[PDB]
C-alpha cells in the first residue's frame, strides 16, 4: 500500500505479468484525465507510447531522444458504491493495426490516437465517403476480429460485484531493439464494457475510470 | 495424438501463390511477382494467427509451354531455357525484356531448360530486424514496415523466336522451413478486402439461431 | 565410374516432400535470433485460454454486444428455463466462431473436454440460486426442472460465490446444457432487478487433433 | 563433383521390383497398432482345419 | 546396380553456386606463390587511412584544387560560420567521392564511427581559436556561435596544436559539423593573413556493413 | 558483421562478360573470345582496386539455338552438339569453320548436346610470372605487359544442316576462386574510354553544392 516513485504517490491494497517474463526523473506515476462511463457507453482506447510523449517529462526525453526502451505498468481503477452493477475488460494489446471506415485509404493520425485523451468507441457503423475515420464498431473491435476472442491477449477482469481494480505489467515486445518512437505505436490499452452499467434511480448516473501509467526501465 | 498440433507441422506445406502468363515476342513478356504473404486468401489467414515470424523460404517452380499459331511451313524448335531472376531488397529492377538488369552480377539467377526437374531454390531469412512483421501499427504512408521487404522475381526466355511464337506459364510454391512464432493473435473473422492492408467491413458475430432456447 | 541405377519416381515434384535444396545467396552473415517473449511451441496453448460465447444470437443481437449476455430478471414463474443449447459439433452451434472452435475447425476428428465457466455479472446485493444440468448424449432435453435434477447437474448459488465450473465431454441428439431458475431472484430496494451473465469455454485436459484440413469460413 | 555412371536398366519400371519411396502424407502420427485376436502368418493354417466334401454330386 | 532418386532442383545452374568442376589443364605444374608486400585480407583496411573531403564544392572549385582547401582569413566581424556540410547519406553530401564513401556504395546498411581530423596549414606565426560543434541528429542547425558552445563541441587552439580530432556516429535532418570563428586571427607583420585549412577522414572503430549491391557511380 | 566484407566474399561472383551469336551454314560463324576482364564495366572498376591478383578461373556456358526461316517441306533436325574449344597462350588458332587447328591435340576442349546441363570447365592460374597485373608501366606498344595473357575460346557446331539454318547465341559466365590480392588502389573515378588502355578525360571531383555553408 502507499508505492511512491519520484514525487507522486498512489495508494493499492492482484497483478497479472505480461507473457510470462518480467521487465532519471521520468520515474513517476502519470495519471490520464478520468473518462466517465454511463450507461450508453462503448468503450475507451489510448495508444500508448503517444499519451505519456505530449504531456510529461518523458516526452521531453522523447523529442530529444526518439530511440528507446521502455516497460510500462498500469493501474486501472474505478471507483462505485456497492448498488452498481456492470463488467468491464481492460486489456492490453500489441500491434493494434486498426483498420479504415473508407475501403481504400489509411486513417490519418488524429483520428488513431488523440494526445492523451481517451478515443471513443461506438456501437454503429460509420460514415465512409466523408474522410479518414477509424471504422469504430465495437463487435469487431477495430481491428476485424471478433470481440469475444479478445482474452488471448494479457488481460484482467473488472467486475463491478466483487472486484475493484486491475493492474497490468507489460513487458517490451518489439521486433527490432531500438525503433523510432514518433512513427510507431507498440502498445494499446482497450478497455470495453461487456455488461453496461446498471443502476436505480437516486444513485449517481456515471462511475468514473482513472488510468495510471508508469513506465519503467527507460533506457536511453 | 498432439504432434500433428505443432506449429512446425502446421505451416511446413505448400501453395500456388502465382500464376502468370509471358510470351516470348511481345516485347514486353516477362514475368513479375513480388513475394508477399498476403496473396492467397488461405494462407493469410494461417499466418496472421502469429504477429512475429521468423523462417527460411523455399520457392519451387513449375513451367509448361504451349505453341501459339505460326503462319505455315512446318515449325520446328529445339529445347527452350527460362531464366528466372531474384533481386534482393534494395536492387536494380529490369523494366524490359532487353535491359542491363538481367546481366547484373550481385543478383543470383538460375538457368533451366525443359524437359527436367522443376529448378527448387532456395531462400534464407533476410530482414534487418530480428524477425517478419505480419502487423505495424506505425507509419513508415500507414502500416507499410518497409523492414520486412523480401524481394521480387522475373522471369523471361533466354531464345528467339524463329517461325511460331511459344508463351508459358509458371506457378511458383512456397514452403516456410524452421517456422518460429510469437505473441498469438485471435483469428481474423470478417473478410479480406485488399491485399496491401488489413481493412474491413463490419459483420456479425455468429450465424444466428432462431432464440435463446 | 561409380554405376548408379535410377528407380522410377526420380525426376518428380512431390508437393509435400522433404529435400535440401541449394542456398540462393551465402555468404549473407543472417541476423542472429533475439529473445523476444510470449513464444508458442504448439497450437494448444492457444485453445488453454477462455474466450466469451455468444449464446444470445436471436438473428438481431448478433451485430451488438447483446449477444454475449443472457438476460436474468425476476419473473413472476417459479420454474423457468434461463438459457439453453445443444453441443452438435460444426453444425452452427454457439461453439464455433469462438477461440476453440476456429482452432478445431482445422482438422477433422478430435476429443477432449471443456471447461463452461459462468460469471454472475449482476448486482451485488441480489440472491438467487441456479441449477446447471448437463444432459447426456442419448438422453432427451429435460422439459422440467423436476427431472433435470434427476440428471447430472450442479446447484449454483450467487450469494456465495459469483462464478461456477461446469466441465463436460466433447467428440466429433448429442447433449445439452440448459440452465434452469431454482428459485427467483431476491433483491432490496433501490436495486434494478435484471442481471446478466457470461459464459466462458477452455479446454479442460489436453485434446487430440489428426489429419489437417482447411477451414471453411472463407470465400 | 561426384562421379556417376548409369548402368543399363536405369529408367524402367519392374512390376514385381523392391525399392523404397517418398511418403505422401508426412506428420500424419499413424494410428497405432491394436491386439486383434485370430492373426494368421501362413496360409497353410487355413489348410489345416477340416471342411465337408461333396462325394455326393449326381447332377441334382 | 545402386539406386537413385533424381530430387528437384537436378540440371539447373544457379548463378552463386558453389561446386567442384573438372580442370581444364591436369598436368600443368602450376608457378608457386611469392612473398609480395602489403597482402589485403579484408576491405576494412582500405577504409583505415586517410583521405581528403572535398568541402569546398561551390560549382567551379570542382575542377582544381581548391575543392580541398576552406578559406580563413582575419575578417572585421566576430563570429562567423566558417564552414558547415550536413552528414545526409549518399544524396549528393561531401563524403560521397572519399575513400570512405567509395567502399560503402557497395553496401545497403552500415553503422560505424569517424574520425574527422583537421588540420591548419597556415603560417607559423599566427594564432586563433576555432569551434568544431557537431550538431546531433533531431536538434536543429545553430545559427549562433553561442547556442553551438551550449552543444557538443571542442574549442581548438591553433598557437598550441596544429590538429584537432573529432570523432561522431555515422549510419545509414541527420545533423551538422559546423565550424565556428571563436577570435580573430592575429598575425605579425610581415607575414600573409590569408590561411587555409584541411580536412580528413576514416573509421573510427570497424564498420559493420551486409547484403552487398552494385555502385552507382557508373554509366 | 564483417564477414561480408572479405576478399573472397568480395569477388567470387558471376556476371554475363561475353554475349555473341554464330551460325552454322554461314563458312564463318564460330564464336571468338579472348579473355580478360575488361571486357564489362562493372567488374573492371571491382578488379582495379588492387594491383597485383592471383585466381583461379570457372567457366559455365548457357547456350541456346533458334530456327531460321527455311524453305518448305517439314523440316525435322535431331538434336545439335556444341563444340568450345580452349587455346593456352601461345598456340595455334583457328581462322574457318574447318580447319586444322580444332582436331589438334593439346588443345582441350569440350563437347556438349542440348537437352542437358551447362558445361562447366575449371581453369588454373596460367602465368610465367607469380601474379597478374591489372597496372603495368612499361613497354612490352605501352601498357600491355604479354605476361598476363589467358588464352581465347572458340565455339562452333558439330552438324551440317540438311534443310534448315539454325543460328545459337552463348553467354559466357565467369567466377574467379581463391583469390588474393596486393597493394591496394584508390578507386576509378572517371569514366572509362577503351577497352585496351587506361585513357580517360578529366572530369570534376564530386558533385557540386551551392556554397560553402
Known sequence: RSITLGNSTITTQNVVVGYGVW??????????????????????????????????LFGQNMQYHYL??????????????????????????????????????????????????????????????????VQ?????????????????????????????????????????????????????????????????EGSSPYVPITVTIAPMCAEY | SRSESSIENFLCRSACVYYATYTNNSKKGFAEWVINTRQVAQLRRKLELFTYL??????????????????????????????????????????????????????????????????????????????????????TVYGINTLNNMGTLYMRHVNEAGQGPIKSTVRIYFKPKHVKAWVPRPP?????????????????????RTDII | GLPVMTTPGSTQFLTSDDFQSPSAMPQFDVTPEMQIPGRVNNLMEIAEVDSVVPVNNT?????????????????????????????????????????????????????????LTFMFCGSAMATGKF????????????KNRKDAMLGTHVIWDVGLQSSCVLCVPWISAAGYVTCWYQTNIVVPADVQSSCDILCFVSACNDFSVRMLKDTPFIR
Open chain 2, 54 to 139: 521468423r523462417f527460411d523460404l523455399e520457392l519451387t517452380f513449375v513451367i509448361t509451354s504451349a505453341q501459339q499459331p505460326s503462319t505455315a511451313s512446318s515449325v520446328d524448335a529445339p529445347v527452350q531455357t527460362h531464366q528466372i531472376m531474384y533481386v534482393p531488397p534494395g536492387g536494380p529492377v529490369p523494366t524490359k525484356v532487353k535491359d542491363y538488369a538481367w546481366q547484373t552480377s550481385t543478383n543470383p539467377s538460375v538457368f533451366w531448360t525443359e524437359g527436367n526437374a522443376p529448378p527448387r531454390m532456395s531462400i534464407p531469412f533476410i530482414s534487418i530486424g530480428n524477425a517478419y512483421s505480419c502487423f505495424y501499427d506505425g507509419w
Open chain 1, 23 to 56: 521487465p532519471v526523473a521520468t520515474c513517476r506515476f502519470y495519471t490520464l484525465e478520468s473518462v466517465q462511463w454511463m450507461k450508453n457507453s462503448a468503450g475507451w482506447w489510448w495508444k500508448l507510447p503517444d499519451a505519456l510523449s505530449q504531456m510529461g
Open chain 1, 136 to 200: 469504430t464498431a465495437v463487435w469487431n473491435a477495430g481491428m476485424g476480429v471478433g470481440v469475444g476472442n479478445l482474452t488471448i491477449f494479457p488481460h484482467q477482469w473488472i467486475n463491478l460485484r466483487t472486484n475493484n481494480s486491475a493492474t497490468l505489467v507489460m513487458p517490451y515486445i518489439n521486433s527490432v531493439p531500438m525503433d523510432n518512437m514518433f512513427r510507431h505505436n507498440n502498445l494499446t490499452l482497450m478497455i470495453i464494457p461487456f455488461v453496461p452499467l446498471n443502476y436505480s
Open chain 2, 188 to 208: 481474423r473473422l470478417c473478410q479480406y478486402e485488399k491485399q496491401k492492408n488489413v481493412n474491413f467491413s463490419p459483420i456479425g458475430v455468429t450465424t444466428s
Open chain 1, 68 to 133: 528507446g526502451r521502455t516497460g510500462y505498468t498500469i493501474h486501472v481503477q474505478c471507483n462505485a458504491s456497492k448498488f452498481h452493477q456492470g463488467c468491464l475488460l481492460v486489456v492490453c494489446v500489441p500491434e493494434a493495426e486498426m483498420g479504415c471506415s473508407n475501403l481504400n485509404n489509411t486513417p490519418e493520425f488524429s483520428e488513431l490516437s488523440g494526445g492523451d485523451s481517451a478515443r471513443m468507441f461506438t456501437d454503429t457503423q460509420v460514415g465512409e465517403s466523408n474522410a479518414k475515420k
Open chain 3, 131 to 142: 441449477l446447471l444440468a448437463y444432459s447426456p448424449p442419448g438422453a432427451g432435453v429435460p
Open chain 3, 59 to 115: 438473428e438481431d443481437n448478433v451485430s451488438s454486444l447483446k449477444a454475449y449476455q443472457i438476460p436474468v430478471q425476476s419473473n413472476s414463474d417459479n420454474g423457468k428455463q434461463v438459457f439453453g443449447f445443444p453441443l452438435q459439433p460444426g453444425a452452427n452451434n454457439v461453439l464455433n466462431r469462438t477461440l476453440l472452435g476456429e482452432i478445431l475447425n482445422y482438422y477433422t476428428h478430435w476429443s477432449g473436454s471443456i471447461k
